[PDB]
Design a protein around this ligand. Structure first.
Ligand SMILES: CC(C)n1c(CC[C@@H](O)C[C@@H](O)CC(=O)O)c(-c2ccc(F)cc2)c(-c2ccccc2)c1C(=O)Nc1ccc(S(N)(=O)=O)cc1
Ligand SMILES: CC(C)n1c(CC[C@@H](O)C[C@@H](O)CC(=O)O)c(-c2ccc(F)cc2)c(-c2ccccc2)c1C(=O)Nc1ccc(S(N)(=O)=O)cc1
Ligand SMILES: CC(C)n1c(CC[C@@H](O)C[C@@H](O)CC(=O)O)c(-c2ccc(F)cc2)c(-c2ccccc2)c1C(=O)Nc1ccc(S(N)(=O)=O)cc1
Ligand SMILES: CC(C)n1c(CC[C@@H](O)C[C@@H](O)CC(=O)O)c(-c2ccc(F)cc2)c(-c2ccccc2)c1C(=O)Nc1ccc(S(N)(=O)=O)cc1
Lengths: 417, 395, 422, 421
C-alpha cells in the first residue's frame, strides 16, 4: 500500500525498518519518494546497498548482472561517507603471500592482491634467492608527500617577486608557520618553485606521520597560500593542484625530487644461488638488465621506468594493504641495477632505487579491517607511537625490497628464456 | 584421504619436509595456518576474509599461495550517456568521494546531450630485445623487416600461433648491435599479453632462421612498453587508442559543476598542459585519469598495474557554442590496455561488473568489440572524472 | 657637404646614376627621415659591401660605444651568395676557427673532418678518438632511415570528424591520393608512411619524405601544403591551423624524433684493441664500460633524459655543422645519441663501441652550404652539393661522417673522464 | 735549393735559426719523411699563420680534390688568441654572416641583437618581432636563478654507504665542510644547496654555483674536483667514477635542467596591443593563441617533448650564441623554452606573451668571448667581459637579451603560422 507506507516513514520512532523491500521500491517507481531520499531515510548500511542494487538492476539491459557481485556481511560503516559512494557491493581480489623476504635482519610475509597468474609464485622465488644470499638491505633516503598548486599574478615580474620572496629565509619562515599550524605532523621542508610566465607553481613538501598525507598536505597548502595572499593580494589561486605535485600522472619532478618515500634496496646473490634458484648466470642477468632496463627503456623513451615490473609488485601490495592503487603511476618509479660482485665477479649485486613511493599505514583504505589484517602481517598497521612515520617508512622499505625480489625472478626468467 | 586427518596433523607433515587436498577452501585454510606460524601476530589473519569464495576459478590461472581475498568497495557512477547508450559504471576504490565526483561528471555530460567516442587504433604489443654480432648486422635485420617480403614471413609465423594473432606494422629501433622489435596485434577480446608473447616467440624463432647469429636476449626488452612509463606508448599507442568528447551547455557548467566555461578552460590550460609540462610529464596531461582507470580496472577484472600506461591522457577544453560560452571537452587516451576475457575477468564478481556494462566475455559477432566498448567506457568515464574534478578545482 | 634630400632622391630614381652618385653621408641622411627604410639598401646600393658598410655606420650611431664594431670584420667577404638567401640586415661576418680531426677511418675510407669551434681541446680530443679508431681497423656505419618531416596541425569540428580523417588517411586509397598531391610538387618528393596523432578535434600529421641531398625543410613544407589542400577537398570543414604543429619535430627536443627518426638515422661502431685503449686512450676497456653504463645510461636516466644517452655528441655535431654550412640550431635534435660500450673479442679485453643517432638533420645543398667557405669544408669530405648519379648520397655520407666523428669524440672524452686526469 | 733532410734538421735544431730558415717545401719534406710529427708544427714554426699555411698544404695533398681549401679563408686572422685556448690543428676560419635584429626594447633599454646565421629570413622575422614589442611598449624580464652545475658520479661499496654519504651531505656541517673546499678554489665559487640522487651504490652529486660573468664549466669543475677530494677524506672507500656523470646535465636534453634550472633561469613578457598585432604581425590575438595552445603546448605534448614548448627558440639562441662567442653546443639545453600566449584587454584582443627559459647557459668572459670579433658583438650589447662593480651582471644581462629576443622570434614565427601561405 503506497499511502500507508509513507505513514510508517514519517513516524519518527517507527522508521523504514518496519517497511519491506518491494514497498520502498514501489514508492520510488510511483514517484512518491525521490531516489536520493533513500540514503538518509533508511537505517542500516547493508539494506541501503541491497535496495540500491535492486533499483539499479531493473535499469540494466541484463537485470541479473549483479547476481555474483557479493555485498552481504561487509563492514560498510568504515566506508560510508569516507571511502566509497553509490555502493552496490565489493570486489574480492585474491590475496597470495610471498616470503619470507629477508630485509634488514627481519623476515616479512608480504601480502599481494592480484589476478595475474604466477606473480606471487615468481615474487616468492626472488624472495628465496635473497634469503639464501644473506638478506637484502634498504634505506629510506627522503620522506615528504607533496602538493603542487598553481597561482597566478598579473605579470611575470610579479610571479618572480613572489618566488624571490619564498626563497628568502624570512618569507619561507612565514609560510612554514601557516602550513605547520594545520596539523601535528605537518612540517614544511624547502619549497620548490617554477615560473611559467605569470604562473607560479609551488611544490609544498612535508612529512605526514604514518599517513600517505594527501589530505594533510592539502590543508597545510591552503592555509599557507592564504598567508601568501596577505603579502600578495593580487595573487589568484587557480588550482590547489596545478599538476606540479605530481599526483597520479607520470612526471620527471617525482623522479628527480622524489615524492613520498625515496628508497634504495640492495642484495648480493651468490653464483650458486643464481644457478640453482634462478636457473641462469650472473653474466646473463647483467646483460639483460643493461639492455632491457637501461637501453630498452631508453629507446622506448622512459622517464623513471628503468625496471622490469615494479608496477606489478607495487600494485598488489597496494591493493592488499589499503593503499591508493592509482598512485602506482608514480610509486612504481624504479631503476634496477645489476653488476658482478665477489672475488671472481661471479656473484650478483642487485639494487632497486624507487624515489617516489607514495604510501601510508593510517587513513584511506587502511581504515578497513581486511586491509589492516595485511598491514598487521607486516607489523606496520596504524600509527607508530614511539617513532611517528616509522610504520610508513617500513612498509615503503618492504615495497622496495619486494620489488627487488620481483625484479630478480622476472629478470632471471627472461634471461633463461 | 585428507578428510580423515585434521588441520593440525597435515601441517605436521609439511613442517617435517615430508611433503593435494580434496577441497579448494580447505587448501586456503591450511595455508593460512602454515603462514600463521611464521607471523609475530598470528591473530592478524582473523579479519582477512577467506570463506565462501570460489577458489576454483583462481587456482592455476590467477594466484599462488592464496590465503583469502581483499574486498574493495564497489560504487556506481552513471548513467554515463555515451554513443547514444547509457552505462552504469562500476568503480572499485577506497578513495573518498571519487565515485560521487565521477557521477557528477556523468550528470553534466548527459544534460549536455551525451558524449561521443571513437577507437582510433587497436593492438597490444610486445617489444623483445635481440642482438647481432655487429651494428651492421642489426641494421641488415631492420632493413629486412621493413620489406614487404620480410614482414609477410614474420606475419605468417606470428599469426600461426592463435585465432586472433594478426600482426600489424612492425616498429623497430637499433641501439648499436641491439635491435628492439615491437610486435603489435589485435587479440580478440583478451587484453592479449599471453597471446602476443606466444606469437612473438614463434616470430623471433622464424627470424632466427633468417639470421642464425642472432641472440634473443629477452622476449621483453622494455620496448613494448608494459607497465612502465614510455613515450613509445604515448606516440604509437598500445592496446586501444581512444578519443572521447562532449559539449557541456553554459547553464549546466554553472548549475551542476558550480563554475564557468571560462574558468574551466583556464585551469585546464594551466594545470593539465602547462603544469604537466613544467613537471616534465610525458602523457600525464590530465587531472586524475588514473583514479578512474584504476577504479574501473579493479572492478572489471583488469590488470591494475597497467594503469601506468592505461592512464595516459590529454584533456582538452575549449570555448564552444554561438555565444562561445559552452564547454567543449575531450579526452584522448592513446594506450588503454584492456580485455573482457582472461585474467581477472574469469572470476564471477568481476564478470558481474562487466555484465553491468554489457561487455562481459567475447563478442561472438565481432571479435574484439566488447574490449573496444570497454575502452570507450573507460575513456568516457575518465572524461566525466576530469570534468568534475576540474570544476571542483576551478571553483 | 651633404646636399638636401630632394636632389638626392632624383639621382636615386635615375637609371644611369642610382646610388653610385651619392655619398655615405647622403644615403644615411635619406634613411634618417624615411624615404629609404633600411632593408631596401641591399636592392639599391651599387655593391653588396657598401650596403654592409652603410648598415654598420647606421648601427654604430645607435650604440652606447660607437667603436663596438671595430673588430667585427666585413671587408672582402662574398656577400652575393648571402643576400636574399641566407641573412638580412647584414653588418659583417663572425669567423669561427676551423680545426681538422682525422683521419677518420670510416667504411674503408678516410676522412679529414672539419670542425668549427671555440672550445679548447675539442678538436685535439676528437682527433685522438679518430686515432684510436684508426688503429683498431676503423669504424663501420649504416644509414637506417632517411626522411625529413613536417608535422602540421589541422582541426575538424569534432573529435569524431578528426577520427574520420585519420582512418581515411590510413586507407590505401586515401593515402595514395595524398601521396600523389605531395609528390607532384617536386622530383624528390616521395611521401612515406604517414604518422598521425589525435588530440580531440586536433589532428597532427607527420609528413615524411627523402629530399635529395637537401636537408629538405622548404621542399617538404611545399609538399605538405599541396597535400593538405587535397585533403581539404575530401574534408571541407577541415581547418589548417598551422603548417607546423610542433609534431615534426623541428628544433625542439621531442620523443617522436628519438623513436621515429627524423632526417637521417645512423648507427656507427668500432672495436678498439685492448692495446690501443691503454696506449692511446690512457685507460682500460673495463674502466670505459663502467663509466659508460653509469654516466651515459644510468646518469642520463637519473637526470630524466630523452635521447641524451651520450657524453658530448652535441659538441661534435655543432662543430661539423658550423664548418659545413648546416643549420646549427638543428643541434637540438641532431645531437640525439646513445653510446654503448661492452667487452669484445677472445680476451674480452677489447672495447666494442657504438653510437646510434636517430635524427641527424643534414644536407649538402641549400641554405648555408651555398656559401663557398662552407663548400670548401664539404669538398674536404667529398660531399659538396648534389650527387647526380645517386641523389641523396652526399647527405647520407655526411650523416655517416657526423655519427662516426661523434663516436670518435665519445671514445676520447670517455677515456679522459675514466682516467680522471691520469 | 731545397736541401737534404739531414741538412734541414741541423738548421731546425740550430737555436739561432730554426724553421724560419727553412722553406715551406723543406718543412713539408721533413714531415713527409717522418722527422717531425705533424702535430708538433705549432711549437716549431715561429709565426701562427705560417703554421696554418703548412698544415693546409699537408692536408690538401691528402684530399681527393686538392683544391678544396681554396675558398676556406685563413689569412690575417688573429690565431694568437685561439692557439692553445680555442682550437687545435687549425686550417682556417669559417665566416658566418652576422645580421642585426633590433631595437629590442627590454627592461626600458634598447638592444641591437647580433645574430650569426645562414637561415633565410630568420633575422628579418626576428626583427619584425622586435618591432611589435617596441610598438607594444616593451618587454620586461627577470633572472630567476643563477648557477652553472657539474654532476659527477661517485661509487660506494654498498648502497647503504651511498645513502650514508647522501645523509652526511644533507647535514649542515657535512655540507659546510664541502662548501668550504669548493669556495676555496676561486673568488666567485659559492656552493648552493647540494642536490643528490642515488642509484644503488652510485651517488650523483649536482654541484651548483655562480661563476661571475663566466659560463663557468672549468671553474665549477675545479671546485667540484676539490670538493670530492674533501669528501674522500671522510669516505675513503668512495671511488670517483667520473667528474661528469651526466647529472649536470651539460649538452644533452635533460628534465633536471628544465626543473632545477642551469646557468641562468629567465622569464620575459610583453603585452601587444591589437593594433600592433594587426599592423606589424598581420593577424589577431585570437588566431595566435589558438596556434600557440595547439602547437607549442598540445603539439609538443603529443610529440613527447621535455622543455620544447616553443616554436623556434633554438634558432635565436644559436644565432646569438655564435655571434657572441658562446658554446653553441649548449643551445641543446639553453633553448629550453615554454612560450605562453593569453588574451588581455576588454574584448580579448591584446596579446600577453611570455617565454620562460630555465636553463640559459651563457657567459661574457672566457671561451670564444676572448676573441675580438666575438667581443664586438658583446660590445654591441654592452655586456663584453666582466662587470667589476657588480660581478655577473653582464652574463645576466646577456641571458635576459637571449630570452627577450627569443620572445621576439616567437611572436613573428607564430604570427606567420597563424596567417598562411
Ligand atoms: C612475473 C610474471 C609471473 N611473469 C611474466 C609476466 C610479467 C608481466 O606482467 C610484466 C612484463 O610484461 C614486463 C616486462 O618485462 O616488459 C613473464 C613474462 C614476461 C614477458 C613476456 F613477454 C612473457 C612472459 C614471466 C616469464 C616467464 C618465463 C620466461 C620469461 C618470463 C613471468 C615469470 O616471472 N614467471 C614465473 C617465474 C617463476 C616461477 S616459479 N617456478 O618460481 O614458480 C613461475 C613463473
Ligand atoms: C575527485 C576527488 C574526490 N577529489 C579530489 C582528490 C583527487 C586526487 O585523488 C587526485 C588529484 O590529486 C590529482 C590532481 O589534481 O593533481 C579533490 C582534491 C584535489 C586536489 C587537492 F589538493 C585536494 C582535493 C577534489 C576537490 C574537492 C574540492 C575542491 C577541489 C578539489 C575532489 C572532488 O572532485 N571532490 C568532489 C567533487 C564533487 C562532489 S559532489 N558534489 O558531486 O558530491 C564530491 C566531491
Ligand atoms: C672534449 C673536451 C676537450 N673535454 C672536456 C669538456 C667537454 C664538455 O664540452 C662536455 C662535457 O661537459 C659533457 C659531459 O661529460 O657531461 C673535458 C671535461 C669534461 C667534463 C669535466 F667535468 C671536465 C673536463 C675533458 C676531460 C679532460 C680530462 C679529464 C676528463 C675530461 C675533455 C677532453 O677530452 N680533453 C682532452 C682529451 C685528450 C686530449 S689529447 N691529449 O688527445 O690531445 C686533450 C684534451
Ligand atoms: C623564422 C623563419 C624565417 N620562418 C620559418 C622557418 C622556421 C624554422 O627554422 C623553424 C620551424 O621549423 C620551427 C617550427 O615551427 O616547427 C617559417 C616556416 C616554418 C614552418 C614551415 F613549415 C614553413 C615555414 C616561417 C613562416 C613563413 C611564412 C608563413 C609561415 C611561417 C618563417 C618566418 O618567420 N618568415 C618570415 C616572417 C616575417 C618576415 S618579414 N616580412 O617580417 O620580413 C619574413 C619571413
Amino acid at each position: 500500500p503506497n499511502e500507508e507506507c509513507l505513514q510508517i516513514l514519517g513516524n519518527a520512532e517507527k522508521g523504514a525498518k518496519f517497511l519491506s523491500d518491494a514497498e520502498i521500491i514501489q514508492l520510488v517507481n510511483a514517484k512518491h519518494i525521490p531516489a536520493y531520499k533513500l540514503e538518509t531515510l533508511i537505517e542500516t548500511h547493508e539494506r541501503g546497498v541491497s535496495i540500491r542494487r535492486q533499483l539499479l538492476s531493473k535499469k540494466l539491459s541484463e537485470p541479473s548482472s549483479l547476481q555474483y557481485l557479493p555485498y552481504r556481511d561487509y563492514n560498510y560503516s568504515l566506508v560510508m561517507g569516507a571511502c566509497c559512494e553509490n555502493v552496490i557491493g565489493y570486489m574480492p581480489i585474491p590475496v597470495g603471500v610471498a616470503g619470507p623476504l629477508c630485509l634488514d635482519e627481519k623476515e616479512f610475509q608480504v601480502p599481494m592482491a592480484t589476478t595475474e597468474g604466477c606473480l606471487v609464485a615468481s615474487t616468492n622465488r626472488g624472495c628465496r634467492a635473497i634469503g639464501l644470499g644473506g638478506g637484502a638491505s634498504s634505506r629510506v633516503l627522503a620522506d615528504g608527500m607533496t602538493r603542487g598548486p598553481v597561482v597566478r599574478l598579473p605579470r611575470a615580474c610579479d610571479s618572480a617577486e613572489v618566488k624571490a620572496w619564498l626563497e628568502t629565509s624570512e618569507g619561507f619562515a612565514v609560510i612554514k608557520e601557516a602550513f605547520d599550524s594545520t596539523s601535528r605532523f605537518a612540517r614544511l621542508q624547502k619549497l620548490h618553485t617554477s615560473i611559467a610566465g605569470r604562473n607560479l607553481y609551488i611544490r609544498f613538501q612535508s612529512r605526514s606521520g604514518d599517513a600517505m598525507g594527501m589530505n594533510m598536505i592539502s590543508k597545510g597548502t591552503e592555509k599557507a597560500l592564504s598567508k601568501l595572499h596577505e603579502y600578495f593580494p593580487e595573487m589568484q589561486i587557480l588550482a590547489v593542484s596545478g599538476n606540479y605535485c605530481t599526483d597520479k600522472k607520470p612526471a620527471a619532478i617525482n623522479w628527480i625530487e622524489g615524492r613520498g618515500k625515496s628508497v634504495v634496496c640492495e642484495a648480493v646473490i651468490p653464483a650458486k644461488v643464481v644457478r640453482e634458484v634462478l636457473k641462469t648466470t650472473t653474466e646473463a642477468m647483467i646483460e639483460v638488465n643493461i639492455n632491457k632496463n637501461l637501453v630498452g627503456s631508453a629507446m622506448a623513451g622512459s622517464i623513471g621506468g628503468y625496471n622490469a615490473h615494479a608496477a606489478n609488485i607495487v600494485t598488489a601490495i597496494y591493493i592488499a594493504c589499503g593503499q591508493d592503487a592509482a598512485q602506482n603511476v608514480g610509486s612504481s618509479n624504479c631503476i634496477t641495477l645489476m653488476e658482478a660482485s665477489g672475488p671472481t665477479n661471479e656473484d650478483l649485486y642487485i639494487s632497486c632505487t624507487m624515489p617516489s613511493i607514495e604510501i601510508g599505514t593510517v587513513g584511506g583504505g587502511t581504515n578497513l579491517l581486511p586491509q589492516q589484517a595485511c598491514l598487521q602481517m607486516l607489523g606496520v598497521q596504524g600509527a607508530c607511537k614511539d617513532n611517528p612515520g616509522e610504520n610508513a617508512r617500513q612498509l615503503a622499505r618492504i615495497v622496495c625490497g619486494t620489488v627487488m625480489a620481483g625484479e630478480l625472478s622476472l629478470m632471471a626468467a627472461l634471461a633463461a628464456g
